[PDB]
Amino acid sequence: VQLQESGPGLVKPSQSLSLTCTVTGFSITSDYAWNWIRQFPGKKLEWMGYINFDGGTTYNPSLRGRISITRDTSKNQFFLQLRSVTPEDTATYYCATFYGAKGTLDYWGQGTSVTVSS
Amino acid sequence: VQLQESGPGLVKPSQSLSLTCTVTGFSITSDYAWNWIRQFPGKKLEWMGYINFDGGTTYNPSLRGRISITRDTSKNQFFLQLRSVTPEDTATYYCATFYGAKGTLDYWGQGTSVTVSS
Amino acid sequence: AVLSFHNICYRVKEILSNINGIMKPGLNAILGPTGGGKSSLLDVLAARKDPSGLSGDVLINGAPRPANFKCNSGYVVQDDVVMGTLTVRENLQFSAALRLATTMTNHEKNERINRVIQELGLDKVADSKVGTQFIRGVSGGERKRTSIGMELITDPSILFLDEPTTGLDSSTANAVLLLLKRMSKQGRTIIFSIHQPRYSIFKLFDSLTLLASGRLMFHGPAQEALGYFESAGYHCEAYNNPADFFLDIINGDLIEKLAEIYVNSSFYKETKAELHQLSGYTTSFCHQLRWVSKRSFKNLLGNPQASIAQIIVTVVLGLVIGAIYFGLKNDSTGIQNRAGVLFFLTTNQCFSSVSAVELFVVEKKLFIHEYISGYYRVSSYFLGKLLSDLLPMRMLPSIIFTCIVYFMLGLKPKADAFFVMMFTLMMVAYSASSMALAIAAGQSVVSVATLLMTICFVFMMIFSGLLVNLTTIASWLSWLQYFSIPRYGFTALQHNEFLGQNFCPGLNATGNNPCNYATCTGEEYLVKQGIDLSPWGLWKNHVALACMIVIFLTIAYLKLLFLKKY
Amino acid sequence: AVLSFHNICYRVKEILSNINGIMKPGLNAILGPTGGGKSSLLDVLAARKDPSGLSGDVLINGAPRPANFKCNSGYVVQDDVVMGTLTVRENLQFSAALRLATTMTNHEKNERINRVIQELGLDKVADSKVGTQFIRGVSGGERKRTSIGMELITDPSILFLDEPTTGLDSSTANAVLLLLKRMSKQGRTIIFSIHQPRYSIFKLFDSLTLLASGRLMFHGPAQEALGYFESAGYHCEAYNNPADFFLDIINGDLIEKLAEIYVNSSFYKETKAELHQLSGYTTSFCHQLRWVSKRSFKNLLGNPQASIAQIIVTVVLGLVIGAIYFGLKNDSTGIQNRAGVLFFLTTNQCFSSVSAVELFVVEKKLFIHEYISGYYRVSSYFLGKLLSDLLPMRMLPSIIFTCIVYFMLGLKPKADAFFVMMFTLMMVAYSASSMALAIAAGQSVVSVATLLMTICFVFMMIFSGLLVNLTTIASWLSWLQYFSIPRYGFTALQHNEFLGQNFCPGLNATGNNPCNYATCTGEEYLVKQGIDLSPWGLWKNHVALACMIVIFLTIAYLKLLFLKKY
Amino acid sequence: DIVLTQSPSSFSVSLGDRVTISCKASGYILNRLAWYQQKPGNAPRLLISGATSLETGFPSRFSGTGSGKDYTLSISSLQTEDVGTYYCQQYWSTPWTFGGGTKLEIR
Amino acid sequence: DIVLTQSPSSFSVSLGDRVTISCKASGYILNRLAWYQQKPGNAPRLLISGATSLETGFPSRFSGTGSGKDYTLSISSLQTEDVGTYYCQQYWSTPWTFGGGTKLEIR
Ligand SMILES: CC(C)C[C@H]1c2[nH]c3cc(OC4CCCC4)ccc3c2C[C@H]2C(=O)N[C@@H](CCC(=O)OC(C)(C)C)C(=O)N21
Ligand SMILES: CC(C)C[C@H]1c2[nH]c3cc(OC4CCCC4)ccc3c2C[C@H]2C(=O)N[C@@H](CCC(=O)OC(C)(C)C)C(=O)N21
Ligand SMILES: *[C@@H]1O[C@H](CO)[C@@H](O[C@@H]2O[C@H](CO)[C@@H](O)[C@H](O)[C@H]2NC(C)=O)[C@H](O)[C@H]1NC(C)=O
Ligand SMILES: *[C@@H]1O[C@H](CO)[C@@H](O[C@@H]2O[C@H](CO)[C@@H](O)[C@H](O)[C@H]2NC(C)=O)[C@H](O)[C@H]1NC(C)=O
Ligand SMILES: CC(C)CCC[C@@H](C)[C@H]1CC[C@H]2[C@@H]3CC=C4C[C@@H](O)CC[C@]4(C)[C@H]3CC[C@]12C
Ligand SMILES: CC(C)CCC[C@@H](C)[C@H]1CC[C@H]2[C@@H]3CC=C4C[C@@H](O)CC[C@]4(C)[C@H]3CC[C@]12C
Ligand SMILES: CC(C)CCC[C@@H](C)[C@H]1CC[C@H]2[C@@H]3CC=C4C[C@@H](O)CC[C@]4(C)[C@H]3CC[C@]12C
Ligand SMILES: CC(C)CCC[C@@H](C)[C@H]1CC[C@H]2[C@@H]3CC=C4C[C@@H](O)CC[C@]4(C)[C@H]3CC[C@]12C
Ligand SMILES: CC(C)CCC[C@@H](C)[C@H]1CC[C@H]2[C@@H]3CC=C4C[C@@H](O)CC[C@]4(C)[C@H]3CC[C@]12C
Ligand SMILES: CC(C)CCC[C@@H](C)[C@H]1CC[C@H]2[C@@H]3CC=C4C[C@@H](O)CC[C@]4(C)[C@H]3CC[C@]12C
Ligand SMILES: CC(C)CCC[C@@H](C)[C@H]1CC[C@H]2[C@@H]3CC=C4C[C@@H](O)CC[C@]4(C)[C@H]3CC[C@]12C
Ligand SMILES: CC(C)CCC[C@@H](C)[C@H]1CC[C@H]2[C@@H]3CC=C4C[C@@H](O)CC[C@]4(C)[C@H]3CC[C@]12C
Ligand SMILES: CC(C)CCC[C@@H](C)[C@H]1CC[C@H]2[C@@H]3CC=C4C[C@@H](O)CC[C@]4(C)[C@H]3CC[C@]12C
Ligand SMILES: CC(C)CCC[C@@H](C)[C@H]1CC[C@H]2[C@@H]3CC=C4C[C@@H](O)CC[C@]4(C)[C@H]3CC[C@]12C
Secondary structure, eight states: OOOOEEOOSEEOTTTEEEEEEEOOSSOTTTSOEEEEEEEOSSOOEEEEEEEETTSOEEEOTTSOSSEEEEEETTTTEEEEEEESOOTTOOOEEEEEEEOSSSOSEEEEOOOEEOEEOO | OOOOEEOOSEEOTTSEEEEEEEOOSSOTTTSOEEEEEEEOSSOOEEEEEEEETTSOEEEOTTSOSOEEEEEETTTTEEEEEEESOOTTOOOEEEEEEEOSSSOSEEEEOOOEEOEEOO | OOEEEEEEOOBOOBSOOOEEEEEOSEEEEEEOOSSSTHHHHHHHHTTOSOTTSOOSEEEETTEEOOTTHHHHSEEEOSSOOSOTTSBHHHHHHHHHHHHSOTTSOHHHHHHHHHHHHHHHTOSTTTTSBOOOSSSOOOOHHHHHHHHHHTTTTSOOSEEEESOTTTTSOHHHHHHHHHHHHHHHHTTOEEEEOOSSOOHHHHTTOSEEEEEETTEEEEEEOTTSHHHHHHHTTOOOOTTOOHHHHHHHHHHTOOHHHHHHHHHTSHHHHHHHHHHHHHOOOOSOHHHHHHHHHHHHHHHHHSOOHHHHHHHHHHHHHHHHHHHHSOSOOSSTTHHHHHHHHHHHHHHHHHHHTTGGGHHHHTTHHHHHHHHHTTSOOHHHHHHHHIIIIIHHHHHHHHHHHHHHHHHHHTOOOOHHHHHHHHHHHHHHHHHHHHHHHHHHTTOSOHHHHHHHHHHHHHHHHHTTSSSSOTTSSOHHHHGGGGGOHHHHHHHHHHHHHHTTOBOSTTOOTTTOOSSTTOOOBHHHHHHHTTOOOSTHHHHHHHHHHHHHHHHHHHHHHHHHHTSOOO | OOEEEEEEOOBOOBSOOOEEEEEOSEEEEEEOOSSSTHHHHHHHHTTOSOTTSOOSEEEETTEEOOTTHHHHSEEEOSSOOSOTTSBHHHHHHHHHHHHSOTTSOHHHHHHHHHHHHHHHTOSTTTTSBOOOSSSOOOOHHHHHHHHHHTTGGGOOSEEEEEOTTTTSOHHHHHHHHHHHHHHHHTTOEEEEEOSSOOHHHHTTOSEEEEEETTEEEEEEOTTSHHHHHHHTTOOOOTTOOHHHHHHHHHHTOOHHHHHHHHHTSHHHHHHHHHHHHHOOOOSOHHHHHHHHHHHHHHHHHSOOHHHHHHHHHHHHHHHHHHHHSOSOOSSTTHHHHHHHHHHHHHHHHHHHTTGGGHHHHTTHHHHHHHHHTTSOOHHHHHHHHIIIIIHHHHHHHHHHHHHHHHHHHTOOOOHHHHHHHHHHHHHHHHHHHHHHHHHHTTOSOHHHHHHHHHHHHHHHHHTTSSSSOTTSSOHHHHGGGGGOHHHHHHHHHHHHHHTTOBOSTTOOTTTOOSSTTOOOBHHHHHHHTTOOOSTHHHHHHHHHHHHHHHHHHHHHHHHHHTSOOO | OOOEEOSOSBOOBOTTOOEEEEEEESSOOTTOEEEEEEOTTSOOEEEEETTTEEOTTSOTTEEEEEETTEEEEEEOSOOGGGOSEEEEEEOSSSSOEEOOOEEOOBO | OOOEEOSOSBOOBOTTOOEEEEEEESSOOTTOEEEEEEOTTSOOEEEEETTTEEOTTSOTTEEEEEETTEEEEEEOSOOGGGOSEEEEEEOSSSSOEEOOOEEOOBO
16 A cells, blocks of 8 residues: 665675565555566566465566565565675566556555666 | 236235336346345335346246246237235235345345235 | 189299199089198189299189279188177178178068078077187087078179088088088089088089199199099099098199199190180268167177176276275375375276277288178278277276266265366377277287287386376486376376365465475475476376377278288 | 985076985085086085075085085085185185184194195295296196195095186196095095096096986996997997097987986986985184284285385386486466376376275185184185285385475475375375275276276366366356365365465565565365365365265275175 | 354343354354344345355444354354344355354343 | 466557556466556556456446466556556466557657
């Protein structure tokens, strides 16, 4: 219902990327699924994956073993960790909400820019 | 959306009962299912059957071969015919609407009384 | 006719070392133990073995055996190859239709058959069935005379017999050999191989060829073998059968001890002198196919139990299925019941098409015998057997099943849906049967073929689309679904059934989807299973089944063409 | 010993008309055609026929045959009943364990076996396997001597032989009968029935009993039959076997013509005079069960092909199933994949338990022989065969299947769910096997039993809950679901798997149902199929499977108890 | 089918009081439960659907809680516009069945 | 997977004009189609769901019509608050894919 990304805006290649999304106004263990999306320069949207309200997870197959999504219900957060980073995945990263009964991404975050350079 | 029963309020035993429900504000061929219910004296509700938006029909098994439900889309009506009537089914008959996606009887008619005597 | 064999050496390892002799008109017996070349020399002499292993020369009246030999000579097999479901006249008619020339008339062929029936003594049984499991038939003594009559139709000059008495009783065998001897008096050269005869048999032979371990222990007149062994250093006591006496010698009461004695004998000298005195298709494709089809259909009508029972089972099963699934509803259980009944129908066609293993396996020996003898080609026999047995008995269950269950269940009430279901069921039956033929063509034991068919069908069933969703299998493994006959059958049936259906009462899903996970329409169910919604998504399955039929019937024909006939 | 039969009339229709004679120490042969009472008189004399049909009296040294007769007499069967997977010493050990007294020592039993091995001449093969399909074994001539040794363990005074030479070769049979004759010199009464012997055999007999069409054509010394027939108006020429001469007489080269001549003969008078001169369990239940179990397990280890192959197949299949269903998801396809894999597992157990038809069918003849001979009871044999074969080879596939697929598929990761699945698979295997036994106990052909098992399993599969929804069947027909082993197996597996599962990602169905037709939780799927959500809805299936096991194993034991042993 | 049983065929309460109505089903219903309120002279009116959800047009005094086979309707701080008969209905299986009904009174 | 293709990678229109955006899928989607509008500097915003339904918070000028594999977004009588990029997204299969996007211009 109200999402907010946060994390390092600059990352060394082939190390890791870690973002945090904190949810206010809703319990991430209550209903929905909690997704990460990235928009490339030269706008192109790519869904990365989600973590379900019960802790189950599902990822885009185009990110083979590089992505993990975890959560922390004690303060209502979910985290994106994208490992072994290249300069190609320098996108804008969003966290979004997926109702399921409706099927669409209803609530989005503000989006945070991540630049992979050296 | 708006239902209205009509028909004979008194019937000779073992002949037939025919009621009409005319729907205003919605097309009976558009979405829902269209049901008949009867409430006995000494209040007891009994679902009789429905006709679907595509013409399919389903009846209560406690009315074996005695009931038929038809429709007339030219003026948005559906009809209940209960044949070989006895003095036991002297109830109040309602037409109701069943959404399906929700599961409940949402809109009802005013209800018409039918007395089986001689 | 005089059949002379000179320095015959068949090798497969060797089976015949060095065999010489001559057989003139009369009764020529080839005796010895079971290991020796008793049944090997008979096939070498009858051109029923591969000439690749042959070394010596076999001659007839001074001229080598022509390519027209096996058609002009009769060869009677040990066990029966007579159709027990035809009659004694019908077997001979089928034989005369393909072994005689088309120039002749049916009146002439019928007179040949009448003369042959009379000479054998088969008048009072000429119109009785030879006999099968279900059908009571003639005694085993007149089945042999029937099998002899199917070779005298062409009236040969040389008649070979593979153990004419093994299996018969004593009083039967005696009459059979007295018949053979009366035949040998008209001027036919009769050459057989007996297994341990009795003296009432041995007293009829006119020439004896004793073989042991592929070595020639004796060859000459059959009445002089006793004296030969008496003067070779052996004595036979009273009340001892000479044919028993010989095998008692061969057993040990040494093989090179008897072979050298015979090589140094006077008989060997006379034989070598006599052997250095001298040397020093029929019919059209359509005729053969027609007669093969006629015989296979008489055999299918005359065997009602195994053909009627498949119809009874098809009706009973169809009425049970129509009673369990009576009145399919368009509600929460309609998808499950429709999918389940269609899956059962397709997999039932596949598993009921296992009896096609029996098509070419049960009559493999008769096929080999009649192909060698020049009855027909592999092509016409194959086509006639496909046309008479596989075609009419795989079409009928599909028709019966559809006609019974389609209106009890209440499937899509259109004429084209009804006929597409019928044709799809027909195609899956034909495809499973062609696969069974390709697997079992050329074999001789049903058990392994049946087991392999069941294993393959069990795997094809997993990839058919009900037990596992085919869109979820891994890419390195998903390609196996294209090898599933049940998959094409089931996909066509589902496409034909589910197209215009609703399954959520009170909800107009076809317009829009209220809630994302309802599966309220047949299009949603079909796409969720990976099925194509276009009309090509229906007939793609039928072209894949037709291609499977063609490939499997070509494999079955190439397995019959390259089968060893020797 | 002297076995005397007087005015014997066995009736089933009659098979033996009136037979009289006596057999003293020596070699007593019973000859004749196959129809006559050649094999009937042997069973009457050996107490191996029902005394209900018997009329006359059979006597031993003046005293009637005691109830202890068949235990003190040896009877060798025509075909082999030796365990081809044991060794020549092991068969005799199993025989001495159950045919000798428990008072004796193992040292005494071993000396009995050594003396018996020495007397037969089985020293160099005493520790070689008799031989089966997969195992190379001794020649067929020494298997017969092994079968003869399993009867001399108790050292009887009367030894009956049903055709000791039928199937053997000439040189084998001669040595076998010379062994029998050397035995008959020590003082044993040997009584056999030969099929058309040779003179080297006929010259050993000490008394001849010729039967034809249940009529006594001759009885007396075997050397005087020639003169008897010579003076009855017949002549035998030179080089003719007398045993052939007799059956040539019986065939017709009349039955009352030979029966009256023998009744008016001097032999008949002497026999009637001699017959009017005179007349005028072993072991404990546990011992038998232990030894039956030991032999059946040696037989199961010695036959690795048909026991290892079921393990190979269980592993291969389990790895293929684990590759196709790898990583079950909790999404729109999770219900279909879980239900499909559980259905395949249950029905695979049911169809792989069809080889249990072979348990009591393959060794029916050996069981009948050893039960008559007083080896064990039906109860101990039944229990030992169940304990050694059915128990260890039906438990192991379930364990292997569960251990392989449970973690590749990613099923419910609890220890109790894992073990409940293992136990359910075990129970469905045991129940299907008990049904197969109940169907095939007492029969002798596998084909009909296998067909009936498959038909029953095919019907039980329709009522298992996947192909048709069990809540939708008509009431006059729904009661058949309680006769389905796959139904109880599948219901227990589904109850165990689906309980705490969600199947719609992003939707908290467990709290509330947003839209009425989503089927988002495993409880909804279970209730929609008609399954009970309580723990009794799980174990009700296991108690129904245990009751089925007990009923079917009681039917199989009552079918073995009431089987005809005669 | 599925028979729905309401034990208190009748009640008796006063204003401001709390009342609880029970419904028991003979089979698992999985929250496919609805509550209707009928006044004398009118057709039934849907009050609760999904055994927990409340219909728009009713105060936040009615509440539904149930699981399995036991469902309840709680009317806390009842008023006089609340008196009537209350029916539970299952819409899980196709022959939809109602409960016997429970009439409220006023002391 | 399912690739979504928008042919007009760019457009050009004026106010009051009618514009139509096309989306084509490589597989059957069954109205599991959504339209998002993105302004420069903001996250995407859901405009249409179910390929026909319109989201609350948007005028009745946007409309969706499609079936099978061809879906369209019609903006009749466009204003200046409508310029941006438009994405189609399928939510039928688990790897959800977006369209390439179509940027609107103003003449
Ligand atoms: C009678 C019929 C049931 C037997 C038929 C057959 N259907 C099957 C369907 C199967 O699907 C599975 C269960 C539902 C989905 C998956 C599995 C197995 C079978 C079998 C067995 C098969 C067989 O073993 N043999 C033939 C012909 C033999 C026969 O019974 O025909 C006579 C005339 C009675 C002898 C057969 O017909 N089936
Ligand atoms: C290997 C296995 C597949 C064969 C097994 C078996 N599973 C079945 C499962 C079936 O489900 C249907 C399809 C999915 C749902 C319904 C149907 C039929 C089968 C069969 C056939 C059966 C059989 O005919 N025989 C035995 C043992 C013979 C054997 O193959 O064992 C050796 C060691 C290889 C010889 C068997 O094991 N099956
Ligand atoms: C389901 O709703 C669809 C609309 O989404 C109905 O179909 C339309 O009906 C109107 C009025 O009859 C027609 O003018 C349209 O041409 C129809 N559109 C389509 C796409 O068919 C439909 O009637 C409803 N289903 C049923 C069975 O009535
Ligand atoms: C699904 O929703 C249920 C109920 O709507 C959630 O369970 C409730 O959680 C709250 C707070 O965590 C507890 O106080 C309640 O007692 C729970 N009620 C029940 C009936 O269990 C549940 O958390 C949601 N599902 C998941 C997986 O979290
Ligand atoms: C509706 C179903 C049963 C169609 C079955 C077609 C069957 C019955 C047809 C197809 C080919 C036909 C055979 C073709 C050739 C011949 C040779 C003819 O001289 C005698 C009949 C006979 C043997 C026909 C008998 C009937 C036959 C076998
Ligand atoms: C009696 C048996 C042999 C019939 C099986 C062959 C028939 C049914 C096959 C062969 C060609 C097929 C037809 C091809 C053309 C059409 C017309 C179309 O509008 C629907 C499909 C339909 C109707 C098919 C129905 C099935 C079909 C008619
Ligand atoms: C879905 C998948 C797993 C099903 C299995 C398909 C494969 C293994 C099956 C389908 C058709 C089968 C073949 C059918 C015909 C032949 C030709 C013959 O020369 C021997 C058997 C053989 C070669 C079979 C081998 C196994 C086979 C190729
Ligand atoms: C011995 C056997 C396995 C030979 C091979 C048979 C199978 C694998 C071959 C023969 C005919 C082929 C089919 C012919 C036509 C089509 C339609 C096409 O749009 C998809 C592929 C498909 C469906 C082919 C799949 C592979 C196929 C089924
Ligand atoms: C149309 C679809 C269903 C496939 C039809 C398959 C049939 C027509 C094919 C498959 C195998 C083929 C046979 C294989 C090869 C030969 C050898 C030739 O000398 C005579 C024809 C003959 C015997 C063929 C006849 C046609 C045949 C039977
Ligand atoms: C884990 C699985 C394989 C359990 C299987 C149990 C099997 C292997 C056990 C159960 C009963 C056991 C038999 C019970 C009785 C005897 C008699 C004993 O004097 C020798 C061993 C022998 C023959 C045992 C062999 C092994 C046996 C057959
Ligand atoms: C190794 C093989 C033979 C084991 C088969 C028998 C075992 C698995 C059976 C017998 C008794 C059964 C257990 C009885 C009690 C419990 C504890 C409970 O919290 C869940 C069920 C569970 C866990 C059962 C699991 C299955 C079970 C353990
Ligand atoms: C769900 C329904 C349709 C499954 C079929 C149930 C019936 C037909 C099955 C289940 C158990 C089976 C029985 C198992 C045991 C025996 C005893 C034996 O002497 C003959 C077979 C016989 C008599 C079987 C007959 C068929 C049988 C009764
Ligand atoms: C010869 C065979 C078929 C005899 C009959 C076996 C079957 C039908 C009998 C034996 C054991 C019985 C089961 C024993 C226990 C229960 C639990 C009860 O809550 C439901 C009935 C049920 C499930 C019985 C059903 C009928 C049953 C399965
Ligand atoms: C507990 C569940 C799995 C059922 C167990 C079935 C077993 C224990 C039952 C079924 C059949 C029974 C046999 C049937 C009758 C007899 C006759 C008696 O003189 C000796 C025991 C014996 C041979 C029984 C032993 C126990 C037995 C094998």
